[PDB]
C-alpha cells in the first residue's frame, strides 16, 4: 500500500520479488536425539557407523579406526558434549565436532614411547 523513499524495492531493484526472499548433508532423521540433564544440559547423539550411507567407505573406515573409544557395543558412534546451559548450543557443538571428524578423516606421549621402547628391548628372548 505505502512505499517509502528507501523502500526495499528501490534499495535493491534486482531482488524485487515479494516471495523470492523465502525460497531455498548430515541427515537428522538418521541420527538420534536425546537429552539428559546432569547445571548444564547434555545433548546426546548416536548413530550406526557401519550403515552410515551418508559417509564414504574410506571416511567410515578412518572414523572407526581413529575414534574407537566412542564406538558402542552394537556398532554406534556415541558422542556427547555438555558445556552450556542450553541444548541448542550443545547440539551445534556436536554437529561441529561431527563435521570436524568427517573432514579430518577425509584428509605426555614421550613416557609411553620410552615404555614401549623398553618393552621392545626386554622382548629379546630367543632360543
Amino acid at each position: 500500500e505505502f512505499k517509502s523513499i528507501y523502500s526495499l524495492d528501490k534499495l535493491y531493484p534486482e531482488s524485487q520479488g515479494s516471495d523470492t526472499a523465502w525460497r531455498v548433508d548430515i541427515p537428522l532423521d538418521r541420527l538420534t536425539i536425546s537429552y539428559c540433564r546432569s547445571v548444564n544440559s547434555k545433548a546426546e547423539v548416536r548413530f550406526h557407523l557401519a550403515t552410515a550411507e551418508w559417509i564414504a567407505e574410506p571416511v567410515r573406515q578412518k572414523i572407526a579406526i581413529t575414534h574407537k573409544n566412542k564406538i558402542n557395543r552394537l556398532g554406534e558412534l556415541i558422542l556427547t558434549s555438555e558445556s552450556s546451559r542450553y541444548q541448542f548450543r550443545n547440539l551445534a557443538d556436536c554437529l561441529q565436532k561431527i563435521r570436524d571428524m568427517i573432514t579430518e578423516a577425509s584428509q605426555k606421549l614421550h613416557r609411553i614411547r620410552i615404555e614401549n621402547m623398553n618393552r621392545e628391548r626386554l622382548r629379546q628372548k630367543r632360543i
Partner: protein, 287 residues
C-alpha cells in the same frame, strides 16, 4: 465467615473506634525529659554538640579516600551508550500464553507496550528493545517478531518454529512516539519520519545474518540454511503455510507506525485522518 458473625454485635463503628495498626505509627521521640534531656543526644563539647562538623568525606585534612584514587574512563560516555531492556523467550511465551500480545499480528513495539511485557522508557538513552536467548527450549510461538537486537541462537530458535525475525532502528523522537502514541496524537502534530541509523549501526543493519531491513532480501534464505546446518532442524518452508501474507509485512523504512505513514495527521475526536496535500510537503516527506 466469623468476621461478620463478630461484627453482628458491638456498637456501630463510628470515627471514635479508629486505631492504627499496632507497630506502625512509631511514637515521637522529643527531647523533653530526664532520659531525653541534659545533652539532648548530642554528646560532649565539640562540633558534635554544636552541630558544625566538616563536609562529607573529610578526614581531618588528609587526602580523602575518594581523591587518592586516580581517574579512569569508567562512565565517560555513559550518557550516550545505547541501552535496551532485555526480552527473554520465556517472557514472550508467557505473554502469548496469558493472552496479551497475540501472535496473530506483528509483534511490534506498540503491541508489546500495550501488553506490558517489557516496560521501557523513552528517556534514559533507550533506543528500542533487545533479545535474550533464555527460553531456547520449550518455545513454540510461530510469529514475525521485531526486535532491535538478536543473536544467531535465538534467531534460529525462532525461525525453526515458523517465525520471521527482523531488526529495525527507532530514533529518539521516533522511539518516544512509538512508546506512547496516544499523547503524541493528542498533542496535534503530523506523524514524523524516522531517520537512518548512524555509521556505527549502518553495517550492523545492512547484513542478512542478523536479519536487517537494509540488506539484500535474497541473502535471507542463505543465512537461514547456514543457521539450520549449524543448529540442525530442517527449515519449515514458510511459503507453504496459512499465514504467509500476514508474516510477509516487513515495514518499509521511514515508517514509524506499522499501519500509518508519515505526513498524515490523526485526530482523536471525530475519528478522521487528514491527507498531506501540496507537492512540496509530499516531496519533503516521501518524495
Amino acid at each position: 465467615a466469623r468476621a461478620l458473625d463478630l461484627l453482628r454485635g458491638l456498637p456501630r463503628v463510628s470515627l471514635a473506634n479508629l486505631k492504627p495498626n499496632p507497630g506502625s505509627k512509631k511514637p515521637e521521640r522529643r527531647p523533653r525529659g530526664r532520659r531525653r534531656g541534659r545533652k539532648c543526644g548530642r554528646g560532649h563539647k565539640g562540633e558534635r554538640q554544636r552541630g558544625t562538623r566538616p563536609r562529607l568525606g573529610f578526614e581531618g585534612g588528609q587526602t580523602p579516600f575518594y581523591i587518592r584514587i586516580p581517574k579512569y574512563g569508567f562512565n565517560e560516555g555513559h550518557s550516550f551508550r545505547r541501552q535496551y531492556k532485555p526480552l527473554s523467550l520465556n517472557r514472550l511465551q508467557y505473554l502469548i500464553d496469558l493472552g496479551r500480545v497475540d501472535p496473530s499480528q506483528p509483534i511490534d513495539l506498540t503491541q508489546l507496550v500495550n501488553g506490558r511485557g517489557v516496560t521501557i522508557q523513552p528517556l534514559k538513552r533507550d533506543y528500542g528493545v533487545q533479545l535474550v536467548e533464555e527460553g531456547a527450549d520449550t518455545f513454540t510461538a510461530k510469529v514475525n517478531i521485531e526486535v532491535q537486537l538478536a543473536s544467531e541462537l535465538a534467531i534460529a530458535a525462532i525461525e525453526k518454529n515458523g517465525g520471521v525475525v527482523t531488526t529495525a532502528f527507532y530514533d529518539p523522537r521516533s522511539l518516544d512516539i512509538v512508546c506512547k502514541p496516544v499523547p503524541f496524537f493528542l498533542r496535534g502534530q503530523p506523524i514524523p519520519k524516522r531517520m537512518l541509523p548512524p555509521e556505527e549501526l549502518v553495517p550492523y543493519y545492512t547484513d542478512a545474518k542478523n536479519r536487517g531491513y537494509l540488506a539484500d532480501p535474497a541473502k535471507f534464505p542463505e543465512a537461514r540454511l547456514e543457521l539450520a546446518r549449524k543448529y540442525g532442524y530442517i527449515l519449515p518452508d514458510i511459503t507453504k503455510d496459512e499465514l504467509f501474507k500476514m508474516l510477509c509485512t516487513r515495514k518499509d523504512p521511514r515508517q514509524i507506525f506499522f499501519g500509518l505513514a508519515p505526513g498524515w495527521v490523526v485526530n482523536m475526536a471525530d475519528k478522521k485522518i487528514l491527507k498531506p496535500t501540496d507537492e512540496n510537503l509530499l516531496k519533503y516527506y516521501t518524495s
